[PDB]
Amino acid sequence: TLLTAINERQFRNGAHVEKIPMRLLVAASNELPEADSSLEALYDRMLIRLWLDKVQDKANFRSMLTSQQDENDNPVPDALQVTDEEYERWQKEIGEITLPDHVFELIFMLRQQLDKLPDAPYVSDRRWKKAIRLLQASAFFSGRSAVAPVDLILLKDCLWYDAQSLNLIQQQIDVLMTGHAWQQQGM
Amino acid sequence: HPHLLAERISRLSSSLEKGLYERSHAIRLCLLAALSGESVFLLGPPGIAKSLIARRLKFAFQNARAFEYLMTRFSTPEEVFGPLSERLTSGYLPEAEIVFLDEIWKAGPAILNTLLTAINERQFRNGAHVEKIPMRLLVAASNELPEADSSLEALYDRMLIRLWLDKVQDKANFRSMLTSQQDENDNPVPDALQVTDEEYERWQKEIGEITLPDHVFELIFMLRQQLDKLPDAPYVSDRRWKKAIRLLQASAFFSGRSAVAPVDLILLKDCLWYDAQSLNLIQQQIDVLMTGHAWQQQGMLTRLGAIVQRHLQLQQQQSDKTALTVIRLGGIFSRRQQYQLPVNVTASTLTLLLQKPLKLHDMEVVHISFERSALEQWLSKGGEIRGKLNGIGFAQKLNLEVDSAQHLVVRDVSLQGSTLALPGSLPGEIKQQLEELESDWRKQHALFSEQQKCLFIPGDWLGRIEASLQDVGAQIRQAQQ
Ligand SMILES: Nc1ncnc2c1ncn2[C@@H]1O[C@H](COP(=O)(O)OP(=O)(O)O)[C@@H](O)[C@H]1O
């Protein structure tokens, strides 16, 4: 039932179906699912995959250990809160972002590079198509009208899937970001 | 009326391809099975639009309900066919036109047993009384292949169409796919192209009424017997052959034809295979029959050789009129040097016939093709010479020698003499048989130019049928020179 709420955004309520206004879906755990199980369907549909950990800086640990801010309060002012009309209007302007020819040469190069390495994780067409929706919205909320080459850094938390693919995805993207992104290696 | 049906089918599948690139062979194959009562199997990695094709086929009908479900290792029949109270089957499987089951190679024994009765009997055990199921299309996708000795082989043998989908490969088709603004949950099919419930029930009766020509039966029986002799060929049972006719007869009905066309045999490349080993053998065995016995390609090649053999037989029979005189030359030399004819012969790989045939290398021959570059050295310097038999094989050594009347004598193992002769400067019998064979090539090529516009035929396969028909017409035109 969780797969139909993401693609169709509906729910089988006995007889008639109704839409679900799900704007954000977060899933946390601790371990990784099996490589040959039924739980791989939900993992392949989740776009962003973050690997959170504990704090490491000493200066950031003192202010965190003694924080008087309530976790169940409202620390966001009313002037910065978006309305329901602004959320429905932004969904139409996200897909209207133009795709420059320079950005397409970087996506096709990174996709072909992972198909040659045996230890590289397989990226399906669903992961590539859904990554554009997050990349186009990154430039829309930043003051841009087209896809910028700097938005390719967000792919480091989407292509990976386990501990072995984390060190390979962050390494292959860093080469393209410091080589073919701004014509570094081309020059 | 039958000609106008091909326009509506070609326009219906065109609207279904909006937003799905490099998936033309998957949409047209699922549309034919949805209008004929068959099934379809999809194989590939998860993430190649394997679930959108199941939700897109429900838009072609006026009243069609979709059903998406993922079969797990601990799945229960109460979650697929609806739980009981007599069974709450409101929107599940017994009352669904198109059902989608992902990863079917891992379900339970209770769900697999109930799924076999919904295809053959098209019913469901609803506690006491049974009710029919209006299932018009059944699609099953996964990622891996079932075991060779397991209970999951019963459902795989019943699935007719087996497609092996993969990711995109073209660079131009990837840019438009990566940035597609078409909604996947919308309705991109107009109301004028959507079929009704009355048209679906009427087409099921006209599918079985398609006549089976005698020329098509000779191709099905030949392909079935060819797979029974190869050990690495997949076994095709009687259920697979019988169900393949329902998809072949409906392919010509929706294209403007009343009988089974030989071009419909290309659809068997996604039904006979079952694994990675049978994929390279099924596509290869069908391509030979499609470019050999489908349009009489190989049938005319063996008939053309009989005309060439008959022309060489009549030339060696009348060889007593033209002999072979070798002129002499003067000069100062220790050996008797001989010279060939000047302008009378100018070809390099010329052929020379003979009168009485002999047995050379434990085989018969009717003409020996010599080389002009090696004949000048043997007639002057001497030594040994080589030459192939019947214009084929390697240049074998022969017992060539000169005669008292300036002629060439070829001996064998019994010291039998044979005077060689050159062919003179088209008989009426050869031209009559060549004109009849050329007329059959034009009639066979006209049939391909009237049925290649089928929607259920891939585009890359048309390049091999046209290239195979042109090779036969080019070989018959060289003999009449
Ligand atoms: N080859 C393709 N061509 C066009 N669109 C595709 C392709 N593969 C995937 N998509 C798009 O990705 C979206 C999600 O596909 P998904 O259902 O995850 O595929 P699968 O069922 O194979 O996992 C679909 O809406 C589809 O439009």
UniProtKB/Swiss-Prot annotation, chain A:
Subunit comment: Homohexamer. Interacts with ViaA. Interacts with specific subunits of the NADH-quinone oxidoreductase complex (NDH-1 or Nuo complex), particularly with NuoA and NuoF under aerobic conditions, and with the fused NuoCD under anaerobic conditions. Interacts strongly with the inducible lysine decarboxylase CadA/LdcI, forming a large cage-like structure composed of two CadA/LdcI decamers and five RavA hexamers. Does not interact with the constitutive lysine decarboxylase LdcC. Interactions with ViaA or CadA/LdcI and phosphatidylglycerol are mutually exclusive.
Protein name: Regulatory ATPase RavA
Role description: Component of the RavA-ViaA chaperone complex, which may act on the membrane to optimize the function of some of the respiratory chains. RavA functions as an ATPase. The RavA-ViaA system is involved in the regulation of two respiratory complexes, the fumarate reductase (Frd) electron transport complex and the NADH-quinone oxidoreductase complex (NDH-1 or Nuo complex). It modulates the activity of the Frd complex, signifying a potential regulatory function during bacterial anaerobic respiration with fumarate as the terminal electron acceptor. Interaction of RavA-ViaA with FrdA results in a decrease in Frd activity. It also interacts with the Nuo complex, known to be involved in both the aerobic and the anaerobic respiration.
Cell compartment(s), UniProt: Cytoplasm; Cell inner membrane
Family named by the database record: Belongs to the RavA family.
Phenotype upon gene inactivation: The double ravA-viaA deletion mutant shows increased persistence when grown in the presence of fumarate and kanamycin.
Chain positions recorded as ADP binding sites: 71
Record note on domains: A protomer can be divided into three domains: the N-terminal domain is the AAA+ module, which is composed of two subdomains, the alpha-beta-alpha subdomain and the all-alpha subdomain. The second domain is a discontinuous triple-helical domain. The third domain, named the LARA domain, contains a compact antiparallel beta-barrel-like domain forming a unique fold. Binding between ViaA and the triple-helical bundle domain of RavA results in the enhancement of the ATPase activity of RavA. The LARA domain mediates RavA-CadA/LdcI interactions.
Portion of the full sequence shown: 126 to 312 of 498
Induction: Part of the ravA-viaA operon, which is under the direct control of sigma S in aerobically grown cells. In cells grown under oxygen-limiting conditions, expression is largely dependent on the anaerobic transcriptional regulator Fnr. The operon is coexpressed with multiple anaerobic respiratory genes, many of which are regulated by Fnr. Levels increase toward late log/early stationary phase.
Superkingdom as given in the UniProt entry: Bacteria
